[PDB]
Enzyme design. Structure first.
Site, PDB file in Angstrom:
ATOM      1  N   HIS A 114       0.815  -1.095   0.066  1.00 44.23           N
ATOM      2  CA  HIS A 114       0.207  -0.030   0.091  1.00 44.23           C
ATOM      3  C   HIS A 114       0.662   1.125  -0.007  1.00 44.23           C
ATOM      4  O   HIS A 114       2.151   1.241   0.265  1.00 44.23           O
ATOM      5  CB  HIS A 114      -0.646  -0.122   1.304  1.00 44.23           C
ATOM      6  CG  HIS A 114      -1.919  -1.083   1.400  1.00 44.23           C
ATOM      7  ND1 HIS A 114      -3.205  -1.065   0.724  1.00 44.23           N
ATOM      8  CD2 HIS A 114      -1.553  -2.510   1.688  1.00 44.23           C
ATOM      9  CE1 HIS A 114      -3.793  -2.363   0.992  1.00 44.23           C
ATOM     10  NE2 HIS A 114      -2.714  -3.125   1.512  1.00 44.23           N
ATOM     11  N   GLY A 141      12.156 -22.460   6.697  1.00 40.22           N
ATOM     12  CA  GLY A 141      11.111 -22.375   7.494  1.00 40.22           C
ATOM     13  C   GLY A 141      10.690 -20.863   8.061  1.00 40.22           C
ATOM     14  O   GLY A 141      11.648 -20.068   8.605  1.00 40.22           O
ATOM     15  N   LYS A 165      15.591  -7.293   0.126  1.00 39.55           N
ATOM     16  CA  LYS A 165      16.627  -6.769  -1.108  1.00 39.55           C
ATOM     17  C   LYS A 165      16.680  -8.179  -2.042  1.00 39.55           C
ATOM     18  O   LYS A 165      16.875  -9.135  -1.398  1.00 39.55           O
ATOM     19  CB  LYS A 165      17.826  -6.447  -0.615  1.00 39.55           C
ATOM     20  CG  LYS A 165      18.059  -4.736  -0.585  1.00 39.55           C
ATOM     21  CD  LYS A 165      17.378  -4.085   0.269  1.00 39.55           C
ATOM     22  CE  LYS A 165      16.907  -2.519  -0.031  1.00 39.55           C
ATOM     23  NZ  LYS A 165      16.144  -1.901   0.973  1.00 39.55           N
ATOM     24  N   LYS A 182      27.552 -16.270   2.525  1.00 42.37           N
ATOM     25  CA  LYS A 182      28.540 -17.042   2.376  1.00 42.37           C
ATOM     26  C   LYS A 182      28.173 -17.217   0.364  1.00 42.37           C
ATOM     27  O   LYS A 182      27.122 -16.842   0.070  1.00 42.37           O
ATOM     28  CB  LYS A 182      28.165 -18.292   2.931  1.00 42.37           C
ATOM     29  CG  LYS A 182      28.966 -19.683   2.383  1.00 42.37           C
ATOM     30  CD  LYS A 182      28.832 -20.751   2.882  1.00 42.37           C
ATOM     31  CE  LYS A 182      28.415 -20.943   4.669  1.00 42.37           C
ATOM     32  NZ  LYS A 182      27.406 -21.741   5.104  1.00 42.37           N
TER      33      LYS A 182
END
Lengths: 186, 186, 186
Positions: A114, A141, A165, A182
């Protein structure tokens, strides 16, 4: 002269209370209810409903119960898709997912958002931005993916990450907000 | 001589296994079951059940399926309330929500908590602290709000935030823990 | 010559599509469906189903609706177990829980994981590592616990924590990732 649906799909402001969108959402919840109400052994029935629900599905699909979708047809999934318990695909815009992607339980993909401005927001104007997940991605999860995100090929997202991002390919990324930690070999 | 319910409502230690509280919770789950079992097109039935469930409701309300509540009557909602898929209102104490508030999917509002001391906690003594959300607030997906929090008018909470401290009005706040990141014009 | 189940239980790589594991999971979802479909007043029926589902249960158990499990028999719970709304126990390996442990709503315990290597992962090879929670532990809403974690006695985990490292006894820990913030007296 775009319809509300056309505005929605192309990332422009639209009114979700548009009559046609309301109906599409209702149909989606019908298929979704049927999927969620199947008994444990009804594997083929669930697969059928997925093929009626999703925009596209591969040869093999394995989706665990309670799914939440808004439209269905905006969810486009590649080969060997796996989603565990209680994922949600808020698919106001395209949710495009590659091959050999697997979601752990409670993965949430949110394409809707919104205006930050209260007055504009209260007028009911709303937006979407599509989400793209590449091939060979494993999402842990409770991960939350926000609108407009793309995740590259060969990525692993740690449990509980909030992805705000874009994530470049061949990496492991975790955290809130989600950061690469990593690199992986291709 | 306060009852357990009176202790509960006023933020004092109480025993949830009190017979009257047990019954109120059972009634709540009955309305909640009925709400969650409605079919997709039963819009007016769901609205009715909300008006029987919540302490107060505005003219317009739009709440998506699976809600979780403990009592119902402690949830007080203003005009044009919107909650998306699978929100939970653990309303041991008042959950007071202003006008034009909208919850994305999986927003969790927890008013209940326990003693940090193991022995006190194991005795079954329990607490609540009310939550207050102002007018014109938008809360993103998967946000968790803890007991005793107040969120000011004209606030936007980013997806996945864990709100452990009060949020002042006219701000955007995100994170775990949730921090203000930007001010907005009134 | 270990079976797939034996590999699974001992933390070795295994194929979840093994015929016997598939059947065990189906049985689990049957008990789980029955549990989740009970009406609000069916307290004793739910307790019975728990005793058929879990590997072990104490004298008193109190588990709120929608639970998610994979196997059931790998969940071993001590005296006075309490879990609130919509917890998930992904019990590919042992989930061992002590006495007087209480889970707030939406606590997720994940024992299953995959290879970081895409090719190995796509071959379907999969892993588990058991989770151990001690006595007198209180876990807040929306907490995620990852595989192989142990949480010591007398611990409180703050809402929304993602537990990626072991937590020593007699502490309060919060955050993503979850860190100790305070010590408690024994």
């Amino acid at each position: 002269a775009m319809t509300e649906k056309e505005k929605m799909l192309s990332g422009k402001g639209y009114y979700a209370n548009d009559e046609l969108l309301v109906k599409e959402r209702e149909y989606c919840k019908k298929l979704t209810r049927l999927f969620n109400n199947t008994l444990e052994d009804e594997y083929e029935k669930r697969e059928d409903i997925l093929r009626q629900l999703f925009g596209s599905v591969g040869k093999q699909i394995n989706v665990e119960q309670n799914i939440r979708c808004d439209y269905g047809y905006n969810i486009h999934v590649g080969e060997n898709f796996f989603a565990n318990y209680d994922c949600i695909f808020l698919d106001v815009c395209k949710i495009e997912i590659g091959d050999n992607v697997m979601l752990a339980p409670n993965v949430q993909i949110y394409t809707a958002y919104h205006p930050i401005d209260a007055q504009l927001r209260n007028s009911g104007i709303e937006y979407g931005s599509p989400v793209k997940i590449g091939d060979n991605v494993w999402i842990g999860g409770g991960v939350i993916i926000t609108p407009g995100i793309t995740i590259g090929d060969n990525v692993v997202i740690g449990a509980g990450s909030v992805v705000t991002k874009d994530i470049p390919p061949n990496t492991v990324a975790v955290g809130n907000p989600c950061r690469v930690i990593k690199k992986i070999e291709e």
